[PDB]
Input
Amino acid sequence: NFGFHIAPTHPVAGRLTYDSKKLSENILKQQSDERVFSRAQCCKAIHITLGFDGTNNNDKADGSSVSPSCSNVARLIHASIGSGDDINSRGIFKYYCPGVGTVFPDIKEFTPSNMGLIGAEGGENRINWGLVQLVDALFYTLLKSRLKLNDVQGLVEEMSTNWTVSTLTGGLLENGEKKRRAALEPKLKELEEKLRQRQNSGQKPHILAMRLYIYGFSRGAAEARAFANWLQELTRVSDADGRVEYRFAGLPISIEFLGLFDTVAAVGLPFAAGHMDWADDTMRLPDEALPEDCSFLKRCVHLVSCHEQRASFPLDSIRRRDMNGRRTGPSCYRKWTVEYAYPGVHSDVGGGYGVGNQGKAVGGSEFLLSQIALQHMYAEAFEAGAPLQVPEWRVMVPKIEAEFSVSEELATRFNAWQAQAKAGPLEEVIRRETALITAWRIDRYAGGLRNKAFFANVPPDMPEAQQKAWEALHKRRSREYAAAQQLPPMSAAEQAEWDRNVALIGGEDQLRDLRVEKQFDPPLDQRQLLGAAAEFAHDYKGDWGVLDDGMTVGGVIDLLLGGTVFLINEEDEAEEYSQIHRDGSARYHQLFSAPDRVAPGQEKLVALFDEQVHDSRAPFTDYFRYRLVHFDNESNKRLSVLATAGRVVGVGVMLASVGLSVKRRDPRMLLGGLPEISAFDPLTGIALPMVGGAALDNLRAFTREPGDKVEQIGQLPPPPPLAVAAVQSPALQQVLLAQQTV
Output
C-alpha cells in the first residue's frame, strides 16, 4: 500500500502473535530466490539487515545499565537473525551502526558530541561504513573471513569527502560518488571474480542475490535514505539493450524493506538548522526506472512524530513530486511507500526514553509509547520478508521478547489518540496535533505544573554534588579513552578531586556505570519540566513587556559542521503563533471542562499525554512554532538560506566560523524587506565584507522550495579565500593571522 495515513489502531493481542502459516509465508519470501533458481533444473540468497540508530543513541551504552533505553532500531536489530559464524554461513547477516554523537571505533570516532553539536561527517562515515558491511557480508560468504577493522577504517576514510575550509584555498570539495565507487571497486572486482570462478566450476552453494532490510531512526533514518540512494547509484548497471537492473559484484541486489522512524537530516546545531551536506537531494526515496525484478526498493514504511517541535529536529517526509530531472505533479508518495502519523515527540516514535523519564512509563518499558511504533515496524518488516525472530535461532529469548512488550493500558491510551486523530495531509495533521498538545499544556503547564498529578511521579533530580562528580569523572575517563585509542597523568589536585568524586558515588564499583560512548546526561527532569512549563506559560500569556518593531538576534555559524542554515519569516512566525494559540485554546475547551477537570470521555487521551508523551523541549519558544518539514525540495514553511555550501550568503570571504548579527521584525509586534545581516570574525571581532543587491536578494528570498535555492547557491562561485581577500585589507590581515594560528 501507499500514501499518508494516521497510525493504524493497535490490536488488543499485539502484532507479535503468530500462525504456522504466518511463519511459513515469511520463510517463503526469504526463499524466493532459491525457488526461482531451483525451478530451473544447493543455493542461497544473502539476506542482510542494517540498522542505523538515532541521534545520541548507542546500543552498548544505552542498554548496559539497570534502566536500559535501547531505541527501536536497536530493538529490531536484537530481534533480527544474523548472529554467529553458523547463521552467517547460512547467508543471514546483521549489522548495527551507533548514532551520531556517540562513539564509533570502526570509523575512529572516539569522542561523543559536545552539547548536541553534530557535524555532517559523522553521518557520511556511518553511511559509508554501512556500504562496507555489504562488502563484508559477501566477503565472508565466499572466503569465510571478514574484513579487518583496519581495512574497514581505511575504506570509510577513502570514501569520505573530507569537508573543510582553509584560509588559503577556501572550501575543499570532493565528489562523493567518485570516491565511494573508486574505494569500493577493488573489492567488488575481487568478489565478482570469485563468483565467476564458483559459477564456472559449479561449486555449491550457488550465490544468488543480495536482499537488504534496513532500519533507521532520526539522523540514522537520514543515513538510511542516503545509503539507499548511494547504493542505487553504485549498483545501477542498466545497459545492454537498455534493460535496467541493479547488481553488486554481478549479483542482483534489492532493498526488500526500508523502515524509518521520524527522519531528521539536520546539521547538529531564530536560526533554523537545515540539511547536513550529504543529505541534500538524497532524502528523496529512490525512483524506479522505466517475480518482480526491475525494482531497487520494494517497500518503505516511515513512522513520524506529530508532536515534535524542536528547531533542531526538522522532519524529512518521504513525500515528493514525480520527476527529466524535472518535477511534475503534486507532492505525493512513491508506489510501495507509506507514511504513518504517530503521537509523541521524537523518541516517542523512535524509542530511546528510559522507564520513568519525565514521569512517563513509570515502572515498565511495556508502558513506553514507542513500543507501539516498534511493534508496527516489526509487523511491516515481517510482512516484507525480514529475517526476524518470533516469540532456536528463529526464536526470541526472554530478554528480547520483553523488549517488545505492550501493556493493555498503553494500547488503550494509544488507541484513544488514534481514534480522535483526523485524516489529512501531513501539514493538517501537524496543525491539529500541535493544537492538541498545546491544549494539554494550557492546563498542565500554564495551569501550574508543580501540583499536577503526573509531575509527582517524575523522578527526583540528581543532587548537585553527584552531578559535578559524575561529570568530572566522565570527562577524565573520556579523554583517557580518546587519547589511548588515538593523556599525561592527573596532577595531585586532579587526583584528589578524582577520588572525592569516586567517593561521591558509592566507590570504584560504581565507575563501570560510566559510559564513555555518550556525553553524561544527568537526571534533571524536575527542573527541566518546570522550566519548560514556565516558558510555555509566559509564551501563552503573552505579557511581553516593552517591545520594539524590530529585534536583533546573534549567533556564530560553524561552517565546518558541513550543513545548511536557514532563517524563518517574521510574518509567518507571527501567524503560526496565532493559529497555535487559537486552535490550542479552542481544543482546550473540549479537553477540560474546567481547570484540572478532564471532559468526560477524554480521560484516556489526557492520560496518554500525562504518562506517555515526553517533552523533548524540556521572542517565544518552539512551543509556538510548527515543526519544520521537508518534502524533498519543498518545505511546509517559508525559509531563507542564511548559509550553505560552506558560505554565509552575502559574506564576501570564506571562513571556518562566522559571527552574525541579524536585524529582523519582532513577530510579537505583528500579532495584532529581508533581514539585515552583519558578519564578523569570532576570533578577532573584526567586521567582514558584505555584498548585496538584487541577485543576492533573490538567493535569500523566502520560499517553500529551499532545496531549489540551496542547489542554485551551490552552483554559484564562492567568495574568495581569506588569503586572497586579505591582500587589500589590513583588517582582514589580522583576521587571517588569527585564523592561521588555529
About this structure: DSSP finds 23 helices and 24 strands in the chain. The longest helix spans residues 176-200.
